[PDB]
Design a protein. Structure first.
Ligand code: TD2
Ligand code: CL
Length: 137
Protein backbone atom coordinates (compact mmCIF):
# COMPACT_ATOMS: atom_id res chain seq x y z
CA UNK A 1 0.00 0.00 0.00
CA UNK A 2 1.07 3.60 -0.61
CA UNK A 3 2.08 5.67 2.42
CA UNK A 4 0.65 8.01 3.64
CA UNK A 5 -2.44 5.82 3.70
CA UNK A 6 -5.95 6.83 4.71
CA UNK A 7 -8.27 4.12 6.02
CA UNK A 8 -11.89 5.24 6.30
CA UNK A 9 -13.66 4.01 9.44
CA UNK A 10 -17.29 4.05 8.29
CA UNK A 11 -19.64 5.43 10.92
CA UNK A 12 -16.69 6.02 13.24
CA UNK A 13 -15.14 3.83 15.88
CA UNK A 14 -17.06 1.75 18.34
CA UNK A 15 -16.04 -0.49 21.22
CA UNK A 16 -15.00 -3.99 20.02
CA UNK A 17 -13.56 -2.61 16.77
CA UNK A 18 -10.10 -4.08 16.13
CA UNK A 19 -7.74 -2.41 13.69
CA UNK A 20 -4.75 -4.40 12.47
CA UNK A 21 -1.80 -2.81 10.67
CA UNK A 22 0.96 -4.95 9.17
CA UNK A 23 4.16 -3.53 7.75
CA UNK A 24 7.91 -3.29 7.93
CA UNK A 25 9.96 -0.51 9.46
CA UNK A 26 12.34 0.97 6.93
CA UNK A 27 16.06 0.82 7.61
CA UNK A 28 17.15 4.05 9.37
CA UNK A 29 13.54 4.98 10.16
CA UNK A 30 12.97 8.21 12.09
CA UNK A 31 9.24 8.07 12.89
CA UNK A 32 5.90 6.32 12.47
CA UNK A 33 2.47 7.90 13.02
CA UNK A 34 -1.11 6.68 13.35
CA UNK A 35 -3.65 9.52 13.39
CA UNK A 36 -7.29 8.77 14.30
CA UNK A 37 -9.07 11.84 12.90
CA UNK A 38 -12.29 13.64 13.77
CA UNK A 39 -12.37 16.14 10.91
CA UNK A 40 -9.29 18.36 11.36
CA UNK A 41 -8.84 17.20 14.96
CA UNK A 42 -6.64 14.22 15.82
CA UNK A 43 -8.41 12.19 18.49
CA UNK A 44 -5.42 9.86 18.99
CA UNK A 45 -1.93 10.37 17.61
CA UNK A 46 0.40 7.41 18.15
CA UNK A 47 3.97 8.41 17.28
CA UNK A 48 6.99 6.12 17.69
CA UNK A 49 10.17 8.19 17.45
CA UNK A 50 13.41 6.31 16.75
CA UNK A 51 15.79 9.13 17.69
CA UNK A 52 14.61 11.84 20.04
CA UNK A 53 17.84 13.04 21.64
CA UNK A 54 19.29 9.54 21.07
CA UNK A 55 16.38 7.82 22.81
CA UNK A 56 13.55 5.75 21.39
CA UNK A 57 10.16 6.85 22.71
CA UNK A 58 6.49 6.58 21.82
CA UNK A 59 4.54 9.84 22.05
CA UNK A 60 0.73 9.84 22.23
CA UNK A 61 -1.43 12.96 22.08
CA UNK A 62 -4.59 14.66 20.83
CA UNK A 63 -4.82 17.76 18.58
CA UNK A 64 -7.85 20.02 19.05
CA UNK A 65 -8.41 23.20 17.01
CA UNK A 66 -4.84 22.86 15.68
CA UNK A 67 -3.33 22.71 19.22
CA UNK A 68 -1.53 19.69 20.65
CA UNK A 69 -2.41 18.72 24.21
CA UNK A 70 -0.48 17.02 27.02
CA UNK A 71 1.82 14.27 25.73
CA UNK A 72 1.71 10.75 27.13
CA UNK A 73 5.09 9.09 26.67
CA UNK A 74 5.98 5.40 26.74
CA UNK A 75 9.63 4.26 26.95
CA UNK A 76 8.80 0.62 26.07
CA UNK A 77 9.67 0.52 22.38
CA UNK A 78 8.84 -2.69 20.48
CA UNK A 79 9.66 -1.45 16.96
CA UNK A 80 12.91 -2.32 15.26
CA UNK A 81 14.39 -0.67 12.20
CA UNK A 82 14.25 -3.00 9.20
CA UNK A 83 11.86 -5.48 10.82
CA UNK A 84 8.23 -6.49 10.27
CA UNK A 85 5.62 -5.45 12.81
CA UNK A 86 1.98 -5.87 13.66
CA UNK A 87 0.07 -3.10 15.40
CA UNK A 88 -3.38 -3.90 16.80
CA UNK A 89 -5.60 -1.13 18.10
CA UNK A 90 -8.64 -2.34 20.03
CA UNK A 91 -11.28 0.24 20.81
CA UNK A 92 -12.63 -0.22 24.32
CA UNK A 93 -15.30 1.84 26.06
CA UNK A 94 -12.84 4.16 27.82
CA UNK A 95 -9.57 3.84 25.91
CA UNK A 96 -7.73 2.77 22.82
CA UNK A 97 -5.72 -0.37 23.68
CA UNK A 98 -2.57 -0.88 21.59
CA UNK A 99 -0.64 -4.14 21.17
CA UNK A 100 2.48 -4.62 19.04
CA UNK A 101 3.59 -8.07 17.89
CA UNK A 102 0.89 -9.56 20.14
CA UNK A 103 2.18 -7.90 23.34
CA UNK A 104 0.20 -5.23 25.14
CA UNK A 105 1.92 -1.85 24.85
CA UNK A 106 -0.29 0.96 26.13
CA UNK A 107 -3.76 2.34 26.69
CA UNK A 108 -4.89 5.85 25.78
CA UNK A 109 -7.94 7.25 27.58
CA UNK A 110 -10.52 8.83 25.28
CA UNK A 111 -10.14 12.62 25.24
CA UNK A 112 -12.40 13.05 22.19
CA UNK A 113 -15.67 11.54 23.35
CA UNK A 114 -17.75 11.52 20.16
CA UNK A 115 -16.38 8.13 19.08
CA UNK A 116 -18.81 7.93 16.13
CA UNK A 117 -17.19 11.04 14.62
CA UNK A 118 -13.66 9.55 14.57
CA UNK A 119 -14.03 8.32 11.00
CA UNK A 120 -10.57 8.27 9.40
CA UNK A 121 -7.24 6.64 10.25
CA UNK A 122 -4.10 8.11 8.71
CA UNK A 123 -0.95 6.00 8.58
CA UNK A 124 2.34 7.75 7.84
CA UNK A 125 6.07 7.61 8.41
CA UNK A 126 9.02 5.43 7.66
CA UNK A 127 7.37 2.13 6.90
CA UNK A 128 6.45 -0.19 4.10
CA UNK A 129 2.76 -0.85 4.63
CA UNK A 130 1.48 -4.35 3.88
CA UNK A 131 -2.10 -4.32 5.17
CA UNK A 132 -4.49 -2.10 7.12
CA UNK A 133 -7.93 -3.46 8.03
CA UNK A 134 -10.56 -3.68 10.72
CA UNK A 135 -12.96 -6.19 12.12
CA UNK A 136 -15.45 -6.50 14.97
CA UNK A 137 -14.57 -8.92 17.78
O1 TD2 B 1 2.69 16.08 20.82
C1 TD2 B 1 2.68 15.37 19.60
C2 TD2 B 1 3.30 16.27 18.55
O2 TD2 B 1 4.65 16.52 18.88
C3 TD2 B 1 5.24 17.43 17.99
S1 TD2 B 1 6.88 17.69 18.48
C4 TD2 B 1 6.61 18.46 20.01
O3 TD2 B 1 7.00 19.83 19.89
C5 TD2 B 1 6.81 20.55 21.08
C6 TD2 B 1 7.19 22.02 20.87
O4 TD2 B 1 6.12 22.61 20.14
C7 TD2 B 1 7.62 19.99 22.22
O5 TD2 B 1 9.02 20.21 22.06
C8 TD2 B 1 7.31 18.52 22.34
N1 TD2 B 1 8.11 17.94 23.42
C9 TD2 B 1 9.25 17.32 23.56
C10 TD2 B 1 9.37 17.04 24.92
C11 TD2 B 1 10.47 16.27 25.54
C12 TD2 B 1 10.37 15.71 26.81
C13 TD2 B 1 11.42 14.93 27.28
C14 TD2 B 1 12.54 14.70 26.48
C15 TD2 B 1 12.60 15.22 25.20
F1 TD2 B 1 13.62 15.10 24.31
C16 TD2 B 1 11.55 15.99 24.74
N2 TD2 B 1 8.28 17.47 25.56
N3 TD2 B 1 7.46 18.06 24.62
C17 TD2 B 1 7.50 17.79 21.03
O6 TD2 B 1 7.17 16.42 21.19
C18 TD2 B 1 5.30 16.87 16.59
O7 TD2 B 1 5.81 17.87 15.71
C19 TD2 B 1 3.91 16.51 16.14
N4 TD2 B 1 3.90 15.85 14.83
C20 TD2 B 1 4.47 14.76 14.39
C21 TD2 B 1 4.08 14.63 13.07
C22 TD2 B 1 4.40 13.58 12.05
C23 TD2 B 1 4.27 13.85 10.69
C24 TD2 B 1 4.58 12.87 9.76
C25 TD2 B 1 5.03 11.62 10.19
C26 TD2 B 1 5.17 11.37 11.52
F2 TD2 B 1 5.59 10.15 11.88
C27 TD2 B 1 4.83 12.33 12.47
N5 TD2 B 1 3.27 15.64 12.69
N6 TD2 B 1 3.15 16.45 13.82
C28 TD2 B 1 3.28 15.60 17.19
O8 TD2 B 1 3.97 14.36 17.23
CL1 CL C 1 -15.69 15.21 21.73
Amino acid sequence: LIVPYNLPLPGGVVPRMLITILGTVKPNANRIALDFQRGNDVAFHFNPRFNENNRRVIVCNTKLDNNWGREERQSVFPFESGKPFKIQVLVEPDHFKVAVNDAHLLQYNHRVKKLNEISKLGISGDIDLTSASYTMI
